[model samples]
Target: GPGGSPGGLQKRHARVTVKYDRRELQRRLDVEKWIDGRLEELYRGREADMPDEVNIDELLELESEEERSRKIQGLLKSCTNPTENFVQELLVKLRGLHK
Candidate 1:
């Protein structure tokens, strides 16, 4: 006869929890890298008026995509001399983050 101990199950549960946290961190870093690269390319010459960074997470908190787009446009308009093309491309990139 053998007695059952669930220690292995508990260990696996903790491992899964940490794994998810690490995955989330990696995703955030990847997004940050993408944003930084795009901003550098877009504002190569006009770095004077460039924004320090865009808060994609904050924008995601908006109630709707319309509101988010408006906020992004406002940010770009206020911080940089953005062309219509840049604005549309940024909006598309933001949409990609949702997936």
Candidate 2:
């Protein structure tokens, strides 16, 4: 059992509870916050048909934790200069997904 608690059920229950409740929500929020900060920095100069914050949040919600990281990495893959198109297309797909 977790925390030295006895019983297999107790341990499983404790694990599930934290996985579904505290840690899951906290991880999701943390990912969203990071994405928001990154997007804000990216758009500071050449803002273009930027998606609304609402859509961006929705996109983050749809992606799993790993997927979110990959998406961000994909945008930065070009190194010298990543096109805003990557983000714009992502934003466009986000709206489509909602529909």
Candidate 3:
């Protein structure tokens, strides 16, 4: 968006951008945080691929809205660390569970 072409062209591009939506983007970000529960998850600055670029192809091609949501959620899960907080919380949540 920062690099969008200037003048009326930007308006034209903005009008056609239904492929990306605010609620969907926010949901994707929340899913990322859920997947990478810890704030300490790694980022390689510009070296590691941006998640959107790496995953946009899959995100954009789904036939159903539900499928898109699931695919994005699954991709985010691939890199998740499921932080210690999550582990500890789950243990408390399942007090009677035995493995």
Global lDDT of each candidate: 0.38, 0.34, 0.28
Residues 47-78 of candidate 2 have per-residue lDDT tens digits of 22232223333443455223433353353444
lDDT of 1: 0.38
Which pairs of residues have clashing backbones in candidate 3?
Answer: none
RMSD of 1: 18.0
lDDT tens readout by residue for model 3, 1-99? 487755423111111112332332333343333324322332313211123111222233332223332333342334333323222322221222221
- Among residues 3 or more apart in sequence or in different chains, the pairs in candidate 2 whose N, CA or C atoms overlap within 3 Å are none
Instruction: Write the residue-wise lDDT of candidate 1 on 30-53 in tens digits.
Output: 344544444544443342233433
Would you list the rank order by TM-score, best first? 1, 2, 3
Q: TM-score for each prediction?
A: 0.38, 0.29, 0.21
Clashes of 3: 0
TM value for model 3: 0.21
Error of 3 at 30 (Å): 10
lDDT score, residue 94, model 1?
46
